[PDB]
Design an enzyme around this catalytic site. Structure first.
Site, PDB file in Angstrom:
ATOM      1  N   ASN A  80       0.821  -1.245   0.000  1.00  9.37           N
ATOM      2  CA  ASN A  80       0.000   0.000   0.000  1.00  9.37           C
ATOM      3  C   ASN A  80       0.818   1.240   0.000  1.00  9.37           C
ATOM      4  O   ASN A  80       1.288   1.635   1.019  1.00  9.37           O
ATOM      5  CB  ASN A  80      -1.033   0.003   1.101  1.00  9.37           C
ATOM      6  CG  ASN A  80      -1.716   1.328   1.230  1.00  9.37           C
ATOM      7  OD1 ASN A  80      -2.432   1.752   0.359  1.00  9.37           O
ATOM      8  ND2 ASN A  80      -1.512   1.988   2.357  1.00  9.37           N
ATOM      9  N   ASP A  98      13.175  -8.538  -1.241  1.00 11.20           N
ATOM     10  CA  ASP A  98      13.567  -9.031   0.077  1.00 11.20           C
ATOM     11  C   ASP A  98      15.019  -9.543   0.130  1.00 11.20           C
ATOM     12  O   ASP A  98      15.289 -10.704   0.353  1.00 11.20           O
ATOM     13  CB  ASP A  98      12.612 -10.101   0.561  1.00 11.20           C
ATOM     14  CG  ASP A  98      11.261  -9.537   0.951  1.00 11.20           C
ATOM     15  OD1 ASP A  98      11.223  -8.384   1.422  1.00 11.20           O
ATOM     16  OD2 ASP A  98      10.236 -10.257   0.823  1.00 11.20           O
ATOM     17  N   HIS A 194      25.564   6.431 -10.358  1.00 13.75           N
ATOM     18  CA  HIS A 194      24.866   5.556  -9.431  1.00 13.75           C
ATOM     19  C   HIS A 194      24.295   4.352 -10.199  1.00 13.75           C
ATOM     20  O   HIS A 194      24.114   3.277  -9.616  1.00 13.75           O
ATOM     21  CB  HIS A 194      23.770   6.300  -8.685  1.00 13.75           C
ATOM     22  CG  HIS A 194      22.644   6.791  -9.557  1.00 13.75           C
ATOM     23  ND1 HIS A 194      21.512   6.039  -9.815  1.00 13.75           N
ATOM     24  CD2 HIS A 194      22.465   7.964 -10.210  1.00 13.75           C
ATOM     25  CE1 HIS A 194      20.686   6.724 -10.585  1.00 13.75           C
ATOM     26  NE2 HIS A 194      21.241   7.896 -10.838  1.00 13.75           N
ATOM     27  N   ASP A 264      10.480   6.566 -13.966  1.00 11.90           N
ATOM     28  CA  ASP A 264      11.287   6.936 -12.810  1.00 11.90           C
ATOM     29  C   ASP A 264      10.927   8.365 -12.474  1.00 11.90           C
ATOM     30  O   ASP A 264      10.547   8.655 -11.321  1.00 11.90           O
ATOM     31  CB  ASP A 264      12.764   6.782 -13.134  1.00 11.90           C
ATOM     32  CG  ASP A 264      13.680   7.214 -11.976  1.00 11.90           C
ATOM     33  OD1 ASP A 264      13.268   7.187 -10.803  1.00 11.90           O
ATOM     34  OD2 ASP A 264      14.838   7.587 -12.229  1.00 11.90           O
ATOM     35  N   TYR A 333      15.000  20.809  -5.363  1.00 14.55           N
ATOM     36  CA  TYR A 333      16.223  20.041  -5.604  1.00 14.55           C
ATOM     37  C   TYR A 333      17.484  20.893  -5.507  1.00 14.55           C
ATOM     38  O   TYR A 333      18.434  20.578  -4.790  1.00 14.55           O
ATOM     39  CB  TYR A 333      16.170  19.362  -6.961  1.00 14.55           C
ATOM     40  CG  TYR A 333      15.028  18.390  -7.118  1.00 14.55           C
ATOM     41  CD1 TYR A 333      14.503  17.704  -6.032  1.00 14.55           C
ATOM     42  CD2 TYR A 333      14.506  18.116  -8.360  1.00 14.55           C
ATOM     43  CE1 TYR A 333      13.467  16.783  -6.202  1.00 14.55           C
ATOM     44  CE2 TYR A 333      13.467  17.209  -8.536  1.00 14.55           C
ATOM     45  CZ  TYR A 333      12.956  16.547  -7.453  1.00 14.55           C
ATOM     46  OH  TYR A 333      11.929  15.664  -7.614  1.00 14.55           O
ATOM     47  N   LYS A 336      18.902  26.307  -2.092  1.00 16.95           N
ATOM     48  CA  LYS A 336      20.205  26.864  -1.713  1.00 16.95           C
ATOM     49  C   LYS A 336      20.794  26.283  -0.414  1.00 16.95           C
ATOM     50  O   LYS A 336      21.990  26.119  -0.275  1.00 16.95           O
ATOM     51  CB  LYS A 336      20.094  28.380  -1.661  1.00 16.95           C
ATOM     52  CG  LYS A 336      19.094  28.895  -0.643  1.00 16.95           C
ATOM     53  CD  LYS A 336      18.582  30.281  -1.005  1.00 16.95           C
ATOM     54  CE  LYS A 336      18.212  31.138   0.229  1.00 16.95           C
ATOM     55  NZ  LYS A 336      17.257  30.469   1.160  1.00 16.95           N
ATOM     56  N   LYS A 414      27.081  30.549   5.816  1.00 17.06           N
ATOM     57  CA  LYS A 414      26.011  31.414   5.387  1.00 17.06           C
ATOM     58  C   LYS A 414      26.088  31.671   3.896  1.00 17.06           C
ATOM     59  O   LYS A 414      27.123  31.904   3.349  1.00 17.06           O
ATOM     60  CB  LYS A 414      25.969  32.749   6.150  1.00 17.06           C
ATOM     61  CG  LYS A 414      24.913  32.798   7.250  1.00 17.06           C
ATOM     62  CD  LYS A 414      24.342  34.214   7.417  1.00 17.06           C
ATOM     63  CE  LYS A 414      23.451  34.316   8.668  1.00 17.06           C
ATOM     64  NZ  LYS A 414      23.526  35.563   9.525  1.00 17.06           N
TER      65      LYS A 414
END
Ligand SMILES: Nc1nc2c(ncn2[C@H]2C[C@H](O)[C@@H](COP(=O)(O)OP(=O)(O)OP(=O)(O)O)O2)c(=O)[nH]1
Ligand SMILES: Nc1nc2c(ncn2[C@H]2C[C@H](O)[C@@H](COP(=O)(O)OP(=O)(O)OP(=O)(O)O)O2)c(=O)[nH]1
Ligand SMILES: Nc1nc2c(ncn2[C@H]2C[C@H](O)[C@@H](COP(=O)(O)OP(=O)(O)OP(=O)(O)O)O2)c(=O)[nH]1
Ligand SMILES: [Mg+2]
Length: 500
Positions: A80, A98, A194, A264, A333, A336, A414
């Site tokens: 779900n 799994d 990746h 994706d 995304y 800053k 900062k």
């Protein structure tokens, strides 16, 4: 009992006491280790392939299996998911799911540093990966039923779904920070995506868990289909080996980096918007309902290919998807502060990397940067490494800890401002110079180390810029003013836009 409980010989005894008492056919099932669970997924053709040559006995066999309590759909498992509601998965997919290799994705925040700016964004790669798998399944099903001439089989569909599931297998701690900021900075020589990790880890998954035999037993051909799966995630007359040119469109489902329209993106758009507090204009379900394989002919000798297509008036939909893409990129995304946190975590990891040992296969020790080389070390590499460092008693990690403590106390560098280049851009290899430039650009002693420059890159289908953020490590008022005006002067000098 369930068929889940049945060993192969239990199935053989059931077969015998149901009328099939011939040693060869029993030898089949003994040989392939066909436990009960596989039975309701057996075909006339599968039984043909396995090697029962009785044109009638196949039918009888399937009848026997049909008369049982448990059916095909009765073995599917239901997730779900708050994004897609409930979700059916073929048991093989569960067996892939799994595993340590895949479960490891539960411990990697999707938006990495994002969680420290968007408190809703607590979600990890795991749930998103499930989502992607499911969506892949959806589109391929839809195309299969709308156009039965396509000859799209269960095999193909499962391969596409597995590719779906396992695309994000190889993400490191805090997702894109790792492969996008840490590795490039820690291993400049090595180019690493990746995805590379994804396919390597998939290989490691199926090999660790010995699922190849399972794959065979559910009607897949490991030798072909594994290559297909890998190819879908990774990439390359006809280049691919996994499938014939005739089934080209299948490669446009999971990773369509050509035109950037794949499942994706759909899933993580929807999911990230769900968790961020934004909402997504792009309705993928109506991309799917309006989706068609279509024949495209372009002459370069004429090139005729089967591509996935959407109706002409679903162009306005695509206007959304690409807006939502930018909408998310702009706001969330490439936020800053999120990026600042990613940078600080990177910095900590870098200064932790030399001392942290992570054991792989045969217990060989790996550093954080080199875990990517060995999957069984990489399997242990998660976000948790953040807390491992933070809580470590080793005094060598004082440097790394102090950065992590700062993150905890919101004592971050900062953010002085953002800027844009009027013309030209900054070469990928020019970056290391930038902190020196900004430091030396005078309008207090301000070292090149005191500054971080963050360069950000903004970035067919057929129908039927650069952002520079500067952060300062020194947080005190005098130095803050000095740094601010240093930045403005550097902007002026390089003929850049007015800072933010
Ligand atoms: N916090 C944060 N997340 C990012 C940044 N760039 C990308 N992401 C995240 C947002 C998405 O949810 C996620 C998508 O990664 P995927 O592996 O699913 O797709 P892909 O490899 O094509 O990367 P991409 O589409 O370029 O983001 O990556 C960033 O600069 N900061
Ligand atoms: N301070 C803080 N902000 C959080 C946290 N979790 C999510 N956020 C969000 C709320 C903030 O609007 C956003 C940015 O936080 P910051 O206070 O660090 O922003 P900034 O460095 O610009 O400081 P400022 O707002 O100028 O005082 O992050 C948290 O634990 N602490
Ligand atoms: N819907 C939406 N949410 C945002 C946006 N920017 C940040 N957030 C989210 C994440 C934060 O937890 C919260 C407010 O963040 P803000 O960017 O407005 O303030 P922040 O402290 O990050 O920067 P600041 O020092 O105020 O300039 O809402 C946005 O542009 N749109
Ligand atoms: Mg703030």
């Amino acid at each position: 009992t369930d068929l889940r409980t049945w060993e192969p010989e239990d199935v053989c005894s059931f077969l015998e006491n149901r009328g099939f008492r011939e040693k060869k056919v029993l030898d089949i099932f003994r040989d392939n280790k066909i436990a009960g669970s596989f039975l309701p997924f057996l075909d006339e053709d599968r039984l043909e392939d396995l090697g029962v040559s009785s044109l009638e006995e196949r039918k009888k066999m399937i009848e026997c299996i049909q008369q049982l309590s448990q059916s095909r759909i009765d073995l599917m498992k239901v997730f779900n998911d708050p994004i897609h509601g409930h979700i059916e998965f073929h048991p093989l997919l569960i067996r892939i799911i799994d595993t340590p290799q895949f479960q490891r994705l539960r411990y990697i925040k999707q938006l990495g540093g994002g969680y420290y700016v968007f408190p809703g964004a607590s979600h990890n790669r795991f749930e998103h990966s499930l989502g992607v798998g499911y969506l892949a399944g959806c589109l391929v099903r839809a195309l299969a039923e709308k156009q039965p001439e396509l000859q799209i089989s269960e095999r193909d569909i499962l391969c596409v779904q597995i590719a779906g599931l396992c695309r994000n297998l190889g993400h490191g701690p805090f997702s894109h920070m790792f492969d996008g900021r840490f590795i490039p900075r820690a291993r400049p020589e090595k180019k690493w995506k990746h995805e590379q990790g994804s396919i390597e880890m998939f290989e490691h998954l199926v090999n660790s868990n010995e699922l190849k035999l399972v794959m065979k037993n559910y009607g897949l051909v490991p030798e072909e289909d594994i290559t297909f799966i890998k190819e879908q995630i990774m990439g390359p007359l006809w280049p691919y080996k996994g499938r014939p040119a005739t089934k080209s469109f299948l490669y446009e489902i999971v990773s369509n980096k050509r035109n950037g329209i794949d499942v994706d993106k759909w899933d993580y758009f929807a999911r990230d918007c769900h968790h961020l507090g934004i909402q997504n204009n792009f309705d993928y379900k109506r991309f799917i309902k309006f989706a068609r394989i279509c024949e495209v002919e372009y002459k370069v000798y004429i090139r005729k290919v089967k591509h996935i297509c959407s109706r002409e008036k679903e162009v306005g939909n695509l206007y959304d998807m690409f807006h939502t893409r930018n909408c998310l990129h702009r706001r969330a995304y490439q936020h800053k502060i999120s990026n600042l946190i990613d940078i600080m975590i990177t910095d900590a990891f870098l200064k932790a990397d030399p001392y942290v040992e992570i054991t792989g296969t045969a217990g060989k020790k790996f550093r954080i940067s080199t875990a990517i080389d060995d999957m069984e070390a990489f399997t242990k590499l998660t976000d948790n490494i953040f807390l491992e460092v933070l809580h470590s008693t080793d005094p060598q990690l004082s440097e790394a800890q102090s950065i992590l403590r700062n993150i905890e106390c919101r004592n971050l560098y900062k953010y002085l401002g953002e800027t844009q280049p009027k013309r030209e851009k900054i070469r990928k290899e020019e970056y290391e110079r930038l902190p020196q430039e900004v430091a030396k650009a005078k309008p207090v002693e301000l070292k090149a180390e005191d500054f971080i420059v963050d360069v950000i890159n903004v970035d067919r289908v057929h129908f039927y810029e650069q952002l520079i953020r500067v952060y300062c490590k020194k947080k005190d008022g005098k130095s803050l003013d000095a740094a601010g005006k240093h930045f403005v002067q550097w902007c002026a000098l390089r003929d850049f836009t007015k800072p933010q």
